[PDB]
Amino acid sequence: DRQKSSFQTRFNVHREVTPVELPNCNLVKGIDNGSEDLEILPNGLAFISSGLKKSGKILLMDLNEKEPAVSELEIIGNTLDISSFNPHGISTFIDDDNTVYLLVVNHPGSSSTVEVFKFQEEEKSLLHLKTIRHKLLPSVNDIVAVGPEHFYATNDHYFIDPYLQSWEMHLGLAWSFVTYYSPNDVRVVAEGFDFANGINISPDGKYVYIAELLAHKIHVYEKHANWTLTPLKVLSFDTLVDNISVDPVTGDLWVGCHPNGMRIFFYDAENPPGSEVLRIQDILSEEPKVTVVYAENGTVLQGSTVAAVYKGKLLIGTVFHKALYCDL
Ligand SMILES: [Br-]
Ligand SMILES: [Ca+2]
Ligand SMILES: [Ca+2]
Ligand SMILES: [Cl-]
Secondary structure, three states: OOHHHHHHHHOOOOOOOOOEOOOOEEEOOOOOOOOOEEEEOOOOEEEEEEOOOOOOEEEEEEOOOOOOOEEEOEEEOOOOOHHHOOEEEEEEEEOOOOOEEEEEEEOOOOOOEEEEEEEEOOOOEEEEEEEEOOOOOOOEEEEEEEEOOEEEEEEOOOOOOHHHHHHHHHHOOOOEEEEEEOOOOOEEEEEEEOOEEEEEEOOOOOEEEEEEHHHOEEEEEEEOOOOOEEEEEEEEOOOEEEEEEEOOOOOOEEEEEEOOHHHHHOOOOOOOOOEEEEEEEOOOOOOOEEEEEEEEOOOOOOOEEEEEEEOOEEEEEEOOOOOEEEEO
């Protein structure tokens, strides 16, 4: 039993949270059942996925409003069964015509697909277009879109079956892996992760960032003209890193994190998980500037997974709880 010592470090079981406060944080009214991932367009519209397992939804906020309200986007089309819609990570892709595609990881039962929608702005609706599935996408956590049906995806596990996933995680196999998917060409691009989770890309398309939750790492890969990834750098932290957002103006990373892994994996309302947001600047330079921008123990926001910024505001989502909107 030094599978006790691996467990304590992986799940960061001793960590407590030094508070870092922001001025003027408000809970978003109407978000009570998760807001695991979100993405903000250049014009300030924000998509949020919720009700990850209280049915599954995609929410919309217009972050240009002074006190933004959430509305539920209506999904239309006949290619999607909503009664099992169970959305997880998301990504957007804006084509040359300014069509907005939204890609949504979906877990209908114990399975993964990637659902492609077209966002219809004037109507506040999502036109379902395509269900994607593949043997190289067994357990999809998050994707980053590089076209309407092109993305890199993390699998947080090698197995699909929850019983096996549980064994796979506790054994510490680290078999999780990252897939490039496109209509003509589906390949594994990186492998051997302990719970690969968030994933994103630099604004110029040359670097890919991947969060490895249980190793407390962000990997930086050079992304090449042929879509292949090569390892460049690994950053280490004292926290479980979950989803990565990238600010398109600076390239900075905004990361939602779980300080203590026991509290997010073995939920307990008497000891609920806290929240933490990191900002990472100059991730290529010799000393990347890492800053804790917001941190608390869960008396306001529990289980942060994602954070992004828009024009001076910070929006933070969680696995199964609320969302917080804050001034920086
Ligand atoms: Br915590
Ligand atoms: Ca995402
Ligand atoms: Ca995630
Ligand atoms: Cl399986």
